[PDB]
Amino acid sequence: SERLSITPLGPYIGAQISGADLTRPLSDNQFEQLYHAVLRHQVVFLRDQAITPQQQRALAQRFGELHIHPVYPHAEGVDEIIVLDTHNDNPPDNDNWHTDVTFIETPPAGAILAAKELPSTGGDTLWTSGIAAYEALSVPFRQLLSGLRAEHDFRKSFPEYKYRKTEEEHQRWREAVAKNPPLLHPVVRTHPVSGKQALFVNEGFTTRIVDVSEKESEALLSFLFAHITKPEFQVRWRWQPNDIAIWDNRVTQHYANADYLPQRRIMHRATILGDKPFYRA
């Protein structure tokens, strides 16, 4: 375990990491700086990492317990690794700004994404920094949003109408909804580790801010859903087979382009549980 090559991709978010073989267990010195690079850069990219669901689950396991998605398919024999196999018969549903599974009480602290099969071109994935977004807010707006709570609803990104192909798929949806009722989370979240304040709403699951009026909420979310799309808060990644992406899901949102069908695209994701999102001034 020497020293990983960390190349920032921007001033506020993103970095490429080289010198870490993810197919084989990482030493402690390496896993530590990989961990810190993720916290520091919010999202890191490692190319040429032909890992299997096995080792991917293993790597994620080291960050903590893994979440099992209520609707997405999982890899054979490895229930924690969801398979994102998109094509004509399963159109991509991630071309919207979202933070992974914020519909549970303890949203994932992070995730590891592996590019298995990719289209000739397209399918880029973008990440936006809730930290940079928060920093870009004027003091009056930071004060306004801090302490407010917003509702997150699993159904916003998982509409029932999208799961009625087969009765099985529909049943899977029913069980998912029953187990994931709408819940509240701070609009401004204090990172549990770094202490940095970050915007913590995402168009994918955030339905409304409950501490203001309905029109006030729509006005704020309208602003926020646009605010986070500022180029300066982002890093855009063009995928290559066997790429690996690891991000801190506590302070970022990502968006996956849906510009490749009829071509097929297969991604594998390990999802690391986090703790209860909170805000501390």
State the residues that interact with Cl ion by CB under 5 A. Answer: 125, 256, 267
Is 85 a residue of the active site?
Answer: no
Is 269 annotated in some ligand binding site? Answer: yes
Question: In sequence order, which residues have a C-beta less than 8 Å from that of residue 178 and are 6 or more positions away?
Answer: none
Which among 44-52, 73-81, 144-152, 192-200 is the span making contact with a second copy, rule CB under 8 A? 144-152
Q: Does 278 bind a second copy (CB under 8 A)?
A: no
- Is 217 strand, coil or helix? helix
Is 72 annotated in some ligand binding site? Answer: yes
Is 41 annotated in some ligand binding site? Answer: no
Q: Does 222 bind a second copy (CB under 8 A)?
A: yes
Decide whether 83 or 144 has the Cβ nearer to a second copy: 144
Is 95 a residue of the active site?
Answer: no
Decide whether 107 or 186 has the Cβ nearer to Cl ion: 107
Tell the smallest beta-carbon distance from residue 214 to Cl ion (Å).
33
Is 87 a residue of the active site?
Answer: no
For a second copy, which residue of 78, 148, 150, 244 counts as binding (CB under 8 A)? 148
Is 275 a residue of the active site?
Answer: no
Query: DSSP characters for 107-168?
Result: -EEEEEEEEEE--SS---EEEEEHHHHHHTS-HHHHHHHTT-EEEE-HHHHS-GGGS-SSHH
Tell the smallest beta-carbon distance from residue 190 to Cl ion (Å).
27
Question: In sequence order, which residues have a C-beta less than 8 Å from that of residue 42 and are 6 or more positions away?
Answer: 13, 14, 127, 129, 131, 247, 248, 251, 252
Query: DSSP characters for 70-112?
Result: SSS-EETTEEEEEEEEEBTTB-----S-B-TTTTSSS-EEEEE
Phi first, then psi: give them for residue 149, nearest 5 degrees.
-125, 145
Phi first, then psi: give them for residue 206, nearest 5 degrees.
-80, 120
What x-and-dash track marks residues 165-194 binding a second copy by CB under 8 A?
------------------------------
Question: In sequence order, which residues have a C-beta less than 8 Å from that of residue 36 and are 6 or more positions away?
Answer: none
CB under 5 to 8 A by kind: which of Cl ion, a second copy, none does 216 bind?
a second copy
CB under 5 to 8 A by kind: which of a second copy, Cl ion, none does 85 bind?
none
Distances (CA, A) of 25 to 18, 136, 233, 244: 15, 39, 33, 15
For a second copy, which residue of 3, 88, 215, 262 counts as binding (CB under 8 A)? 215
Q: Does 138 bind a second copy (CB under 8 A)?
A: yes
Residues identified as active-site:
98, 100, 254, 269
Residues within the interface to a second copy (CB under 8 A): 136-138, 140-141, 143-144, 147-148, 211-213, 215-216, 219-220, 222-223, 226-227
